[PDB]
């Protein structure tokens with residue numbers, strides 16, 4: 078339906094500017110970050126299901142799933158983790174000041190490698206190394222499916238989802254890749270980054286490949 | 292939103308009963324039929340674009356795409372063809388009597404092989420050889436995305452689509468496969484049926500495969 082618009086916390090806008098603009102080099106670590114967040118969301122739903130097992134029923138399979146959509150120059154990273162509510166997307170992804178946002182920027186400007194970003198708890202923002210636009214589509218058991226959207230600019234939108242496949246539970250990171258970074262649409266490149274930086278993951282990592290029949 | 296319910300034309304209910312119940316044997320021809328309908332829908336949008344090229348812009352790529360979803364025991368056949376309107380789904384897929392429906396039943400009962408079903412213009416109904424439920428999800432340039440749904444019973448539903456991925460234009464056949472017929476979730480089996488009965492197709496046939504990264 079209609080979209081609500083929210084302004085970014087000053088520093089989060091700052092951080093997004095550093096990342097999408099400068100940085101360079103170790104760009105491929107965005108995938109380790111997103112997979113690690115997916116893994117954390119999966120840990121969370123699974124831990125919650127220990128004392129409330131009905132939670133797993135909206136989507137009984139625990140997985141991480143990567144889907145290149147070359148036509149749209151899009152890369153999606155999906156998990157059937159715990160998902161986020163409207164309130165969650167609004168507060169934790171923009172309006173409330175992340176503790177480590179300022180400290181990481183200072184660390185960065187002082188010599189720190191971007192790959193450290195995850196230890197400051199703002200690794201989600203690494204996605205702007207390779208993308209200039211993101212939709213975070215999420216479904217918690219405690220709320221409806223919503224779309225959060227940001228182009229790195231000063232504000233983001235949150236919209237009730239009536240346009241995307243129903244996920245039973247969890248989250249899709251829909252990355253609109255930059256033109257210089259289309260290599261992350263390639264199967265071999267994807268397997269390679271995964272093997273190098275994400276060897277220790279408790280959940281299956283699926284790769285969706287589209288092949289033409291001969 | 293809310294669902295409108297429609298009764299099937301008597302004979303179409305008859306036909307669906309023959310097919311989902313008896314038949315046996317050459318079940319795999321359902322795929323030749325669906326691919327051929329997809330090809331016809333693609334011919335139609337392409338022919339229409341000859342004198343109105345803006346038509347292709349809702350989805351500039353012409354393709355047929357097969358997606359097994361083993362978790363849900365579902366097989367989807369998609370095309371970016373001309374799609375159908377609400378009016379279309381209601382009239383041509385149920386309420387108005389198909390010319391060849393009765394003649395095919397007589398041919399069938401007289402010895403005719405099911406594979407003939409396409410020459411009687413009711414091949415769409417072959418899908419009930421392998422499925423006991425279908426959603427036909429379609430998007431014409433002249434209307435909104437709708438879901439038509441039937442379980443072979445006497446009536447079907449038509450619903451405004453707010454729950455599925457937006458297709459830009461065209462149609463998805465979402466088959467809920469029977470338990471005896473899960474083989475059509477398998478990549479090798481799919482390639483094999485395609486090669487045997489659908490060698491001459493003017494459009495790319497894509498197969499979406501989900502593989503676990505090691």
Ligand SMILES: COC1=C2C[C@H](C)C[C@H](OC)[C@H](O)[C@@H](C)/C=C(\C)[C@H](OC(N)=O)[C@@H](OC)/C=C\C=C(/C)C(=O)NC(=CC1=O)C2=O
Pocket residue numbers: 113114115117118121156158159160161165169170175198199200201202213248
């Ligand atoms: C330790 O928890 C983590 C925190 C606190 C974070 C807000 C907790 C969050 O709300 C309470 C849920 O507990 C958790 C299930 C949601 C995810 C992991 C999402 O990812 C998904 N579901 O796949 C992630 O991205 C869409 C959301 C924001 C991530 C931030 C801004 C970041 O930069 N790094 C972080 C990574 C983390 O693991 C981070 O700050």
Ligand SMILES: COC1=C2C[C@H](C)C[C@H](OC)[C@H](O)[C@@H](C)/C=C(\C)[C@H](OC(N)=O)[C@@H](OC)/C=C\C=C(/C)C(=O)NC(=CC1=O)C2=O
Pocket residue numbers: 327328329331332335370372373374375379383384389412413414415416427462
């Ligand atoms: C020659 O046109 C065909 C006819 C007339 C048919 C109603 C024409 C239709 O409306 C006017 C559109 O022109 C056409 C674009 C839509 C499709 C081919 C759909 O398939 C898709 N889009 O992928 C198909 O199935 C969802 C719709 C009903 C098919 C029937 C009941 C059948 O059993 N066989 C038929 C196969 C055909 O090719 C048939 O009767």
